[PDB]
């Protein structure tokens, strides 16, 4: 279990590419980055299915087609090394992630998740 407060601060790194904008258009976190998908509603979301994002890689779509819904266990392994995670999960030797960024600290991964659990759950 992470700490939502430390998570919100560490989310600053993710803001270079991601935003968290709700369904009414309110910006919860971030500026205007569109390199990565909107993370609002990511908790429990089938991987690679945010309807507005058109930049998903084959590995990510394939992972969601094989039953990956984001929960803490997979999220933590994923942000630490996206490509390695995609290959393991899919069993596809050619899978590779578009997210070139890698989170270097494990404690941060849990913190950011606690923060997402707070502000990114769609009812
Ligand atoms: C730009 C260089 C990025 C940074 C910095 C971070 N992310 Fe990212 N993310 C980016 C892309 C281009 C993608 C698509 C990946 C693909 O292979 O298709 C993603 C995706 C995610 C996901 C998947 C969500 C989904 O809709 O299925 C997650 C959960 C995610 N990113 C989280 C995340 C976090 C928490 C970051 C900060 C530590 C982070 N990303 C940074 C691009 C970039």
From Swiss-Prot:
InterPro entries: Cyt_c-like_dom, Cyt_c-like_dom_sf, Cyt_c_1A/1B. The keyword NAD does not apply. Coiled coil: none annotated. Binds 1 heme c group covalently per subunit. GO terms for cellular component: periplasmic space. PROSITE patterns: CYTC. GO terms for molecular function: electron transfer activity; heme binding; metal ion binding. Keywords: Electron transport, Heme, Iron, Metal-binding, Periplasm, Photosynthesis, Pyrrolidone carboxylic acid, Transport. One of its GO terms (biological process) is photosynthesis. It is found in: Periplasm. Heme c binds at residues 14, 17-18, 99. Belongs to the cytochrome c family. Cytochrome c2 is found mainly in purple, non-sulfur, photosynthetic bacteria where it functions as the electron donor to the oxidized bacteriochlorophyll in the photophosphorylation pathway. However, it may also have a role in the respiratory chain and is found in some non-photosynthetic bacteria. PANTHER family: CYTOCHROME C. This is Cytochrome c2.
């Amino acid at each position: 279990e992470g700490d939502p407060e430390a998570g919100a601060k560490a989310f600053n790194q993710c803001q270079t590419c991601h935003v968290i904008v709700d369904d009414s258009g309110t910006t919860i976190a971030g500026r205007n980055a569109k390199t990565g998908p909107n993370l609002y509603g990511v908790v429990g979301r089938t991987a690679g299915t945010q309807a507005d994002f058109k930049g998903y890689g084959e590995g990510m779509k394939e992972a969601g087609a094989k039953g990956l819904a984001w929960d803490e266990e997979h999220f933590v392994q994923y942000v630490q090394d996206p490509t390695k995670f995609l290959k393991e999960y899919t069993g596809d030797a050619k899978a590779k992630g578009k997210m070139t960024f890698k989170l270097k600290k494990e404690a941060d991964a849990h913190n950011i998740w606690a923060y997402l659990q707070q502000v990114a759950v769609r009812p």
